[PDB]
């Protein structure tokens, strides 16, 4: 009674969004190394039991739509949901190929009142992206 | 009766608010290497926070930046876990 119930037909969906290439007007460069991340994440989460889907070089609209539709699927027989975002970013915000969209709006689709079949189930988001420009010099 | 609409999210960010996040073009980003490495070994037997805490530790200790630009040389990184979970999470059984 202290652990999430994992007794479902399936562990659940894992959506990976792998953004390597960006419209030059965004100021963003190519994210070399990101394909290797997406490959490793995919192998890793498939091995855990997730149904893995990989999306590439997504616009902001595509990202919003993709997650919205995922939130409208039937998750009744899944234990949880996972989404992994690989991209450029700044504080509270993540880059599509064509601009930035708030992290809050991407995850809001899966709120308890907007995704009733994930209610009381863990909704996981893993986010590889900058959140500003500060550098940690370290110590010792 | 009711459950908060924001309950049961977990956000595993690669870095803390305000800061950059490191990516090696040859080996992938630090956070992802560390995450996959610990998931491969312990994804089935450790609770999710134990996993991410170990990820925090590995990114913090095992990595340090190398750049020809001294402004970006020898920098460090710590990831950032935000939990609204209401139970412990194990990926098995």
């Amino acid at each position: 009674t202290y652990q999430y119930n994992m007794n479902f037909e399936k562990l659940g969906k894992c959506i990976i969004i792998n953004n390597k290439n960006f419209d030059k007007v965004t100021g963003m460069g190519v994210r070399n190394g990101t394909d290797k991340d997406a490959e490793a994440l995919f192998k890793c989460f498939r091995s855990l039991g997730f149904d893995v889907i990989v999306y590439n070089d997504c616009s902001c609209a595509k990202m919003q739509d993709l997650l919205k539709k995922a939130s409208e699927e039937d998750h009744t027989n899944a234990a949880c949901f996972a989404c992994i975002l690989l991209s450029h970013g700044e504080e509270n915000v993540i880059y599509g190929k064509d601009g930035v969209t708030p992290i809050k709006d991407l995850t809001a689709h899966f709120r308890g009142d907007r995704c009733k079949t994930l209610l009381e189930k863990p909704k996981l988001f893993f986010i590889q992206a900058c959140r500003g420009t500060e550098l940690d010099d370290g110590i010792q | 009766y009711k459950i908060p609409v924001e309950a049961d999210f977990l956000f595993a960010y690669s870095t803390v608010p305000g800061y950059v996040s490191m990516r090696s073009p040859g080996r992938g980003s630090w956070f992802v290497q560390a995450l996959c490495s610990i998931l491969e070994e312990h994804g089935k037997d450790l609770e999710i926070m134990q996993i991410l805490t170990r990820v925090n530790d590995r990114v913090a200790r095992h990595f340090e930046s190398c750049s020809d630009d001294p402004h970006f040389h020898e920098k460090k990184q710590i990831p950032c876990v935000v939990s609204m979970l209401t139970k412990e999470l194990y990926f098995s059984q």
Partner: peptide, 4 residues
């Protein structure tokens, strides 16, 4: 190394 690069930054995101």
């Amino acid at each position: 190394d690069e930054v995101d």
